[PDB]
Scaffold this active site. Sequence first.
Site, PDB file in Angstrom:
ATOM      1  N   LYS A 197      17.992 -15.623  74.239  1.00 24.26           N
ATOM      2  CA  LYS A 197      17.214 -14.587  73.577  1.00 24.26           C
ATOM      3  C   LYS A 197      15.847 -15.106  73.167  1.00 24.26           C
ATOM      4  CE  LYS A 197      20.869 -11.557  71.884  1.00 24.26           C
ATOM      5  NZ  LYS A 197      21.982 -11.946  72.779  1.00 24.26           N
ATOM      6  N   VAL A 204      21.141   1.101  50.663  1.00 19.40           N
ATOM      7  CA  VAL A 204      21.556   1.667  49.378  1.00 19.40           C
ATOM      8  C   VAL A 204      22.707   0.837  48.793  1.00 19.40           C
ATOM      9  CG1 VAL A 204      22.476   3.694  48.182  1.00 19.40           C
ATOM     10  CG2 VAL A 204      20.888   3.987  50.117  1.00 19.40           C
ATOM     11  N   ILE A 225      26.595   1.387  49.356  1.00 15.93           N
ATOM     12  CA  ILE A 225      26.833   1.877  50.698  1.00 15.93           C
ATOM     13  C   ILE A 225      26.888   0.694  51.622  1.00 15.93           C
ATOM     14  CG2 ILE A 225      26.103   3.254  52.663  1.00 15.93           C
ATOM     15  CD1 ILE A 225      24.723   5.197  50.788  1.00 15.93           C
ATOM     16  N   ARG A 275      11.192  -7.558  44.405  1.00 15.01           N
ATOM     17  CA  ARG A 275      11.466  -8.828  43.751  1.00 15.01           C
ATOM     18  C   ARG A 275      10.913  -8.816  42.315  1.00 15.01           C
ATOM     19  NH1 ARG A 275      13.913 -12.527  46.522  1.00 15.01           N
ATOM     20  NH2 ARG A 275      13.031 -14.214  45.248  1.00 15.01           N
ATOM     21  N   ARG A 311      15.917 -22.934  38.857  1.00 12.64           N
ATOM     22  CA  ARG A 311      15.264 -23.974  39.639  1.00 12.64           C
ATOM     23  C   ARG A 311      13.744 -23.833  39.666  1.00 12.64           C
ATOM     24  NH1 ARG A 311      18.600 -22.065  43.594  1.00 12.64           N
ATOM     25  NH2 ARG A 311      16.988 -22.191  45.219  1.00 12.64           N
TER      26      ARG A 311
HETATM   27 NA    NA Z   1      24.515  -1.485  50.716  1.00 10.68          NA
END
Ligand code: NA
EC number: 2.7.7.7
Length: 325
Positions: free
Chosen positions: A63, A94, A97, A140, A174
């Site tokens: 690949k 989600v 899910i 984040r 850390r």
């Molecule tokens: Na999920």
Amino acid sequence: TLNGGITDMLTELANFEKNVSQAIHKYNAYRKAASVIAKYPHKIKSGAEAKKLPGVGTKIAEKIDEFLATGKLRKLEKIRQDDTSSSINFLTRVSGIGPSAARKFVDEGIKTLEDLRKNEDKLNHHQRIGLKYFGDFEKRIPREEMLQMQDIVLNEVKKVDSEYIATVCGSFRRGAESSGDMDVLLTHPSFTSESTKQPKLLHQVVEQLQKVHFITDTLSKGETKFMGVCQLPSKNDEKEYPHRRIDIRLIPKDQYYCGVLYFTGSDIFNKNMRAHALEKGFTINEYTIRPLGVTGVAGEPLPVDSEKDIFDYIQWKYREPKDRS
DNA sequence: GTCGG
DNA sequence: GCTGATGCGCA
DNA sequence: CCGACGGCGCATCAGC
Ligand code: NA
Ligand SMILES: [Cl-]
Ligand SMILES: [Cl-]
Ligand code: NA
Ligand code: NA
Ligand code: NA
């Protein structure tokens, strides 16, 4: 950075295997490949070269050759052009899910966020919360906010009882400049593996953090583990902070520091430490450190009063959390 | 998919 | 109502 | 060649 085309490709393949094919081991194989390639210090020039790396085998090498030659992969092109595959893959973004529910939804024509909103009666409590904060949960958390969330939690924990110990672990401990979520390990002198002398130890902490409106939603909660949602307070003038995922784990005191060690990481650090432990000869898991007898049989858990104790048993120079990567 | 008994 | 299985997210 | 590959707490479902 270097080889970003390749690791993106492998990560996309990983997600397809997990979400569509429901093949968790191939997911981890692709992930392991992407990770080793990410840390390779040269721009990969052929599949043969990549194959020298551990976790890159024959198929991934082919690949890589195809991708280097053509700038794409025909397998991924097809996958992306299949409505079902891409919708299932997307729905798994989600929280609540997973591959099974994503497939069930898609089989009945529920394929996008808007479809989910119209069918909120077909969602469980966890899924509704995942849907509600879909965007927020993918952001984040900068270190400055983690520091602010830490103050609130350590403070509120102290307020319920001075003798709780709470430690925020993960990459954050850390010194990471951003985190995915907040993972808090909690303990208390009354809780040991011997017996529980005091009930509701976790519940009173969760309740207090709700009282001051830091915790806003609950995905799950029992005796030892809380999973939910939190938000920093904002100013009236200023923009609201995103909602964030918070986990809190109540751990027996005699297992607390093994817990902190484990949940601080990194994975690669733990891995190396467990191996060096094994030849000294001790076995370390999430809960205990135990000596190995001549025959390879684990003995009783050894006493651990701090993280440094674990390092001493295996005669390893203590490593501060920011040196575990 | 890759690896090691 | 009970028990055990499965889904889920999680170092 | 063939099975291993983290495994665990909680929510919910399946099967009585
Ligand atoms: Na999920
Ligand atoms: Cl698999
Ligand atoms: Cl143990
Ligand atoms: Na290899
Ligand atoms: Na192996
Ligand atoms: Na039922």
